[PDB]
Structure 1
Amino acid sequence: KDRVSMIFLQYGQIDVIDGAFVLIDKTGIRTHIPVGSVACIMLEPGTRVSHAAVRLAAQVGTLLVWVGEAGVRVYASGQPGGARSDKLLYQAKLALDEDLRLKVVRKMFELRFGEPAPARRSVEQLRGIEGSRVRATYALLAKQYGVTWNGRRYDPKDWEKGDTINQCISAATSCLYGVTEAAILAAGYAPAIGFVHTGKPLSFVYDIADIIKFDTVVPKAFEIARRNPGEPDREVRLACRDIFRSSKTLAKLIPLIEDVLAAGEIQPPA
């Protein structure tokens, strides 16, 4: 049916009652879930899933993914390794061919820059501009929200950049990474097969996240860092959940992934 929607489930018991997929609470109140309408269900800590609920999810082709609170990380996935071979080989073919791989890489940079960028530059030149763009975007957000900024922490040995803002950015980015991986898994792709970022277990997750990172997630980190909280990680995770609830961020993940890969000009499976 080609669905793109993703939802969270938390602090409840899950079972199929009268043929219906429902989330029951501690009081006994039960919420109904449109499983056949969603592509992926993200199970947060505190959830308990019955054998019948798992069976129904498999039947309707809705991927079950077990994540941390607010999708801070992905612990486990239903159908590990991948259930959709047509999507994996599609992703693999794009990575195996140098020409197709270049088209995907350049498309990723176009989406990051926000412009078609028709000028023929090398990949190294493209990385340099991005490095400057990210640095500027970080400083711009600090200028916008009035946050003291000494640079992004890229080294755990760099204690000086271990401030409140860098901790909020790390927490927010973690939530984005989790829901991004789940979206990749739901689309039937492999998180480790990346294009711009390579050689890491979550390389493809980074590629997708780096495109939409500064849209809503990272700005929210600066917003929370503005008013110094006692427990930054907690409030950031909550705010990210509210973004995943209010905004259509989760619904845009899968089409973004497909659009990126479609730049290889190879016909996607159907």
Structure 2
Amino acid sequence: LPLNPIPLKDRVSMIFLQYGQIDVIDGAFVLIDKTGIRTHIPVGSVACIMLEPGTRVSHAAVRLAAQVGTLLVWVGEAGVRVYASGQPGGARSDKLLYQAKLALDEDLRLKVVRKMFELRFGEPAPARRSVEQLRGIEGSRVRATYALLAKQYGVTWNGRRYDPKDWEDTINQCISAATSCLYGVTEAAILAAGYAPAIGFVHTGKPLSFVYDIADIIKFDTVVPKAFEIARRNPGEPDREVRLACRDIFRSSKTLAKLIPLIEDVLAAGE
């Protein structure tokens, strides 16, 4: 009797696990505490499981997670992604070769970049502009957008600073955790649909370029403003508030349901 993954839209967004060993008991994903408190995890119903520091995963656990099509993501402090294990062959050859074909030809690559721009800012990109120019426009627009959300939500803002060194400043932590959730479910979606997260168009060079493209498209529409809202209240547990808030945002926005057709419509530029 086989065991196959369920579609992504029918799953929950994410599950954060910490401080405990992850075993397989009777064929189930189980999180055992140091005190012995067993906690079953419906791995087949989650899009991705974030493994915080303190989690000792077993071989059967990674096997089971991969078999039911649930991405494992080792994360560090503030939920920043450290590593990930998934299906060693979840990519469909037609979609993977299509994505790669669009990535190799620079014409279709420019078409996909401009399509990403138009889908991001709701207006067509300026004509006769190169990929670098559109990326610089993206930088200025994102900077001014962070500033505008800052003035609207009444949060002290000075810059992005994604490095946790200069934090010491809870807004950057909230944005990093929120965008970390979005990157987790986005990488999970890209793996599920059959595409390559490393083959990208805008954020080329980075190992998760396509994840950064797709997620950067819908970042400020849903996830970042909620991070500013969590940051304004200044709670004692910013990570938990950002995770719960992102969970509600993904639920109400149907993010998991819209991620794959977003990718298809993005790559649909090169007919």
TM > 0.5 fold call: yes
Aligned residues of 1:81 and 1:190 also touching (Cα < 8 A): no
1:205-261 deviation per Cα after TM superposition (whole angstroms, max 9, x unaligned): 101111101011000010011011122122111211122223212211111111111
| Structure 1 residue 82, shift from structure 2 partner | 3.6
Aligned residues of 2:91 and 2:192 also touching (Cα < 8 A): no
Deviates more, 1:68-77 or 1:197-206: 68-77
Aligned residues of 1:65 and 1:74 also touching (Cα < 8 A): yes
SS at match of 2:49: strand
SS at match of 1:64: strand
Structure 2: 5+ residue runs without aligned partners?
1-8
Aligned residues of 1:43 and 1:66 also touching (Cα < 8 A): yes
Q: Structure 1 residues 258, 139: CA separation in 2 closer, same or farther (over 3 Å shift)?
A: same
Q: Structure 1 residues 103, 225: CA separation in 2 closer, same or farther (over 3 Å shift)?
A: same
Paired-residue identity, %? 100
Aligned residues of 1:72 and 1:176 also touching (Cα < 8 A): no
Deviates more, 1:9-18 or 1:197-206: 9-18
SS at match of 2:12: coil
Q: Structure 1 residues 241, 47: CA separation in 2 closer, same or farther (over 3 Å shift)?
A: farther
Deviates more, 1:112-121 or 1:91-100: 112-121
Structure 1: 5+ residue runs without aligned partners?
266-270
| Structure 1 residue 120, shift from structure 2 partner | 2.5
| Structure 1 residue 78, shift from structure 2 partner | 3.8
Q: Which runs of 4+ in 1 moved over 3 A?
A: 1-78, 154-160
State the Cα RMSD in Å: 4.4
| Structure 1 residue 23, shift from structure 2 partner | 13
Matched residue count: 263
Question: Which of 167, 170, 173 matches 2:173?
Answer: 167
Q: Structure 1 residues 240, 58: CA separation in 2 closer, same or farther (over 3 Å shift)?
A: closer
1:80-134 deviation per Cα after TM superposition (whole angstroms, max 9, x unaligned): 2544111111111111112111111111111222112363222232222211110
Structure 2: distance between partners of 1:33 and 1:231: 23
Q: Structure 1 residues 234, 95: CA separation in 2 closer, same or farther (over 3 Å shift)?
A: same
Asked whether 1:154 is paired with 2:162, we answer: yes
Deviates more, 1:235-244 or 1:17-26: 17-26
| Structure 1 residue 2, shift from structure 2 partner | 13
Deviates more, 1:33-42 or 1:77-86: 33-42
Structure 1: distance between partners of 2:231 and 2:214: 25
Structure 2: distance between partners of 1:230 and 1:200: 33
Structure 2: distance between partners of 1:109 and 1:157: 31
Q: Structure 1 residues 75, 154: CA separation in 2 closer, same or farther (over 3 Å shift)?
A: closer
Q: Structure 1 residues 106, 253: CA separation in 2 closer, same or farther (over 3 Å shift)?
A: same
| Structure 1 residue 71, shift from structure 2 partner | 8.4
Q: Structure 1 residues 22, 259: CA separation in 2 closer, same or farther (over 3 Å shift)?
A: farther
Match of 1:268 in 2: none
TM-score, normalising length: structure 2: 0.72
Aligned residues of 1:40 and 1:186 also touching (Cα < 8 A): no
Aligned residues of 2:95 and 2:194 also touching (Cα < 8 A): yes
1:10-65 deviation per Cα after TM superposition (whole angstroms, max 9, x unaligned): 99999999999999999999999999999999999999999999999999989888
